[PDB]
Design a binder for this molecule. Structure first.
Ligand SMILES: [Cl-]
Ligand SMILES: [Cl-]
Ligand SMILES: [Cl-]
Ligand SMILES: [Cl-]
Ligand SMILES: [Cl-]
Ligand SMILES: [Cl-]
Ligand SMILES: [Cl-]
Ligand SMILES: [Cl-]
Ligand SMILES: [Cl-]
Ligand SMILES: [Cl-]
Ligand SMILES: [Cl-]
Ligand SMILES: [Cl-]
Ligand SMILES: [Cl-]
Ligand SMILES: [Cl-]
Ligand SMILES: [Cl-]
Ligand SMILES: [Cl-]
Ligand SMILES: [Cl-]
Ligand SMILES: [Cl-]
Ligand SMILES: [Cl-]
Ligand SMILES: [Cl-]
Ligand SMILES: [Fe+2]
Ligand SMILES: [Fe+2]
Ligand SMILES: [Fe+2]
Ligand SMILES: [Fe+2]
Ligand SMILES: [Fe+2]
Ligand SMILES: [Fe+2]
Ligand SMILES: [Fe+2]
Ligand SMILES: [Fe+2]
Ligand SMILES: [Fe+2]
Ligand SMILES: [Fe+2]
Ligand SMILES: [Fe+2]
Ligand SMILES: [Fe+2]
Ligand SMILES: [Fe+2]
Ligand SMILES: [Fe+2]
Ligand SMILES: [Fe+2]
Ligand SMILES: [Fe+2]
Ligand SMILES: [Mg+2]
Ligand SMILES: [Mg+2]
Ligand SMILES: [Mg+2]
Ligand SMILES: [Mg+2]
Ligand SMILES: [Mg+2]
Ligand SMILES: [Mg+2]
Ligand SMILES: [Mg+2]
Ligand SMILES: [Mg+2]
Ligand SMILES: [Mg+2]
Ligand SMILES: [Mg+2]
Ligand SMILES: [Mg+2]
Ligand SMILES: [Mg+2]
Ligand SMILES: [Mg+2]
Ligand SMILES: [Mg+2]
Ligand SMILES: [Mg+2]
Ligand SMILES: [Mg+2]
Ligand SMILES: [Mg+2]
Ligand SMILES: [Mg+2]
Ligand SMILES: [Mg+2]
Ligand SMILES: [Mg+2]
Ligand SMILES: [Mg+2]
Ligand SMILES: [Mg+2]
Ligand SMILES: [Mg+2]
Lengths: 171, 171, 171, 171
C-alpha cells in the first residue's frame, strides 16, 4: 500500500530481503577469513586485507538492496546473520576455494532473483541486477578462480614458500 | 523503408511517438505548476523552481525520444500537447500529489512500452528504456512520495507555517 | 598456546568474543533504523544518515576487537548476529530512546569487561577499553540524551512540525 | 626528599632504575643481532637494519625512563649493561625467536612494574606504563611472532632460499 509502489510484486520484495541477508552472510564470512589470516600463527597480511576488502564490498551490496527496497516501496525485513560455516580456514588455497563457492552461491541467488523479476515482468529490478550485481559477480568469480590456479601452481597446500610468495606478489 | 531500419517494429515506432507526446504533456503540466507557485497570492518560490526544473527535464525526456526515433529509422509524428488538467493547483500538497500521479502515469506508459518492445523482441529499445528512463522514474517517484509524507507531517493543507517551512528547508 | 600470548586470561578472550558480537548487534540495529527512516512513509533523511553513520562506527568497534584478539594471541570466535528487536521504529523519539538504551547496554558490557580485566590483572586490556571504548560511549550517550531532550521539547511524538524541524536543524 | 616528590614510593623508584637497565640490555642485544646479520658470511642486510632499528627504539625506551625518574623526583642509578647472551645468532629464525623471548621478558618486567605501581597506589606510574610501554610491547611481540610463523613457512633453518626471500620481502 506504499504511495510509491508500482509494478513491484510481493514475491520480489520478499526475495530482495532474502538476498540482502545473503549479502550480509557473505560479508560476515569474509570478515572471518580476514581474522584468520591476521592470526599470529597464520600471518598472511595481504591475504587478510584482501578478505577484509571483500567483506566491506559485501556490506555495500547489502546496503544497496536496502536502498532499493525503499525506492520501490517495499519494506526491509531483517533476519539473523548466520555465523560462517567454519571457524578456521586452513590456508590460502582452502580459503580461496571457499570464497569461490561463496561467490557462486551469491551469483546463483542473484540469477534466481532475476528469473523471478523476469517472471513478474519487472524490468526495473532486472536492470538493477544486471547493472549493479551480475557483472561484479562474474569479475570476482574470475579473479578468485585465477588465484586458485596460481595457488595450485605454487604447490599449495604443502608448499609454504609458494604460499608466502602468493601473499607477496598476487594480492 | 529507411536504410538504417533494422528490427524496429511499426508498433514500437508508433508507441515511441505516443510516449514523446506524454513527455511533452508532463513538461507542460509542470510548467503550469511553476506559474502557479510564482503567483503573488501563492508565493512559494523554491517550490515554483522545483516544478520549473521538472518541466525542463520532461522536455529533455521528449527530445531524447525524438533522437531515438531517428536513430532507429522511425519517423517522428507530433500531436497537440494537451493543456494541463487544472488551471490552479491548490497548494504544495495538492500539487505534489498531482506530480506523483503524473510520474506514475508516465512510468506506466514506459513499462507498457517495455512490454511492447519485449513482445516484438527489440532488445535495443528495452535497453534504452531501462538505461535512460525507468530508474529516473523510480527516483523521482520516491522523492515526490518523500515530499508528500513531509507535507502531511507539516500539517498541510491547513498549516500555513508548515507549508512555509517546507519551501525553506525541503526544496 | 599462541607464541605471542602473555598475561591473557581465557575468560578475557571469551568475553572479548562476546563483546565483538554485541558491537555487531548494535551495528545491525542501527542499520535497521537507517532503513526505517529512509522509508517513503517516514522520510527523515538526515535522521536516516545519522543512524547509518552510527551503524558504520559500530562495525569499526567490532573490527578493532577482532584485531585486539589476534594481537593478544586469542582466537576470534564468531556467533550469529541476532536481528534487531523491532522491525519498525515508530518515530525519531522512539528510535532515539532505543539508541540510548542500546548505547547504555553496550557501555555496561564494556564496563563489565573492564571489571573482568581488572580481576585478571590485565592492564593492557584495561587501557584498551579506557583509551578506545569508554569515552566514545560517554560521548555518544550524552549526544543521544541531548537529542531526546530536544525531541521532547519539540513536542514528539504528536508534533510533526517539531519532528521535521529536528531533522533539518539537529542532525 | 626532592621538592617535587609526591606519591612516589622508594620501591617504585628502584624498580624504575632496574627497568631502565633492562631496556639498555635489550638495546645492546639488538645491536649484537645487527652486527651479526651485517657479517660477510651472513649478509642479510634488511634483517640487520630491522635489528638496528629495534636497538635504537630500546635506547629511546631507556631515555624515557630516565626522564620519568627525574620528573617524579626519583634519582637515576645506573648499573653495568650486561653483554648479550650470545655472540652469534645462528640465522634469521633463531634471532627472531630470541627477539620474541626478549620482548616477552621486557613485557613481563613492565607488567611486574605495573603490579608494583598498583600496589603502591601510583596512578601516574600506571598511566605512564599503559600509555608509553604496554601497547608498544604487544605490537612488537605480535610482529615478531608473525615473522617467526613466516620463517617456519619458508622452511628455516634449512631453506636458504626461504631465508633470502624473507629478507627481500618481509623487512
Ligand atoms: Cl505494485
Ligand atoms: Cl506494469
Ligand atoms: Cl521478507
Ligand atoms: Cl572450523
Ligand atoms: Cl557456499
Ligand atoms: Cl525493421
Ligand atoms: Cl532480429
Ligand atoms: Cl505515430
Ligand atoms: Cl482548475
Ligand atoms: Cl496523471
Ligand atoms: Cl597467557
Ligand atoms: Cl603478569
Ligand atoms: Cl568464545
Ligand atoms: Cl516491530
Ligand atoms: Cl538495549
Ligand atoms: Cl613521595
Ligand atoms: Cl596519594
Ligand atoms: Cl636503584
Ligand atoms: Cl654464542
Ligand atoms: Cl630473554
Ligand atoms: Fe567480492
Ligand atoms: Fe555480494
Ligand atoms: Fe561477493
Ligand atoms: Fe569485487
Ligand atoms: Fe521529474
Ligand atoms: Fe519524463
Ligand atoms: Fe517525470
Ligand atoms: Fe528527476
Ligand atoms: Fe554510536
Ligand atoms: Fe560500539
Ligand atoms: Fe555505539
Ligand atoms: Fe559516536
Ligand atoms: Fe622492539
Ligand atoms: Fe623496550
Ligand atoms: Fe623491545
Ligand atoms: Fe617496535
Ligand atoms: Mg508481501
Ligand atoms: Mg538465505
Ligand atoms: Mg547456527
Ligand atoms: Mg524475456
Ligand atoms: Mg542494461
Ligand atoms: Mg554494467
Ligand atoms: Mg585479473
Ligand atoms: Mg508504421
Ligand atoms: Mg497520449
Ligand atoms: Mg481540451
Ligand atoms: Mg541505469
Ligand atoms: Mg531523498
Ligand atoms: Mg579459552
Ligand atoms: Mg551477547
Ligand atoms: Mg530470533
Ligand atoms: Mg587503571
Ligand atoms: Mg581517551
Ligand atoms: Mg553536543
Ligand atoms: Mg629509595
Ligand atoms: Mg635486571
Ligand atoms: Mg658476564
Ligand atoms: Mg595507548
Ligand atoms: Mg603486521
Amino acid at each position: 500500500v506504499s504511495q510509491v509502489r508500482q509494478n513491484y510484486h510481493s514475491d520480489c520484495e520478499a526475495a530482495v530481503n532474502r538476498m540482502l541477508n545473503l549479502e550480509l552472510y557473505a560479508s560476515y564470512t569474509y570478515s572471518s577469513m580476514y581474522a584468520f589470516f591476521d592470526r599470529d600463527d597464520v600471518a598472511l597480511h595481504n591475504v587478510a586485507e584482501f578478505f577484509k576488502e571483500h567483506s566491506h564490498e559485501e556490506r555495500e551490496h547489502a546496503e544497496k538492496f536496502m536502498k532499493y527496497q525503499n525506492k520501490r516501496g517495499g519494506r526491509v525485513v531483517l533476519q539473523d546473520i548466520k555465523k560462517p560455516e567454519r571457524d578456521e580456514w586452513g590456508n590460502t588455497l582452502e580459503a580461496m576455494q571457499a570464497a569461490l563457492q561463496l561467490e557462486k552461491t551469491v551469483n546463483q541467488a542473484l540469477l534466481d532473483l532475476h528469473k523471478l523479476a523476469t517472471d513478474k515482468v519487472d524490468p526495473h529490478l532486472c536492470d538493477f541486477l544486471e547493472s549493479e550485481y551480475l557483472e561484479e559477480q562474474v569479475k570476482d568469480i574470475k579473479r578468485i578462480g585465477d588465484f586458485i590456479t596460481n595457488l595450485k601452481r605454487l604447490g599449495l597446500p604443502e608448499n609454504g614458500m609458494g604460499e608466502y610468495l602468493f601473499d607477496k606478489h598476487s594480492v
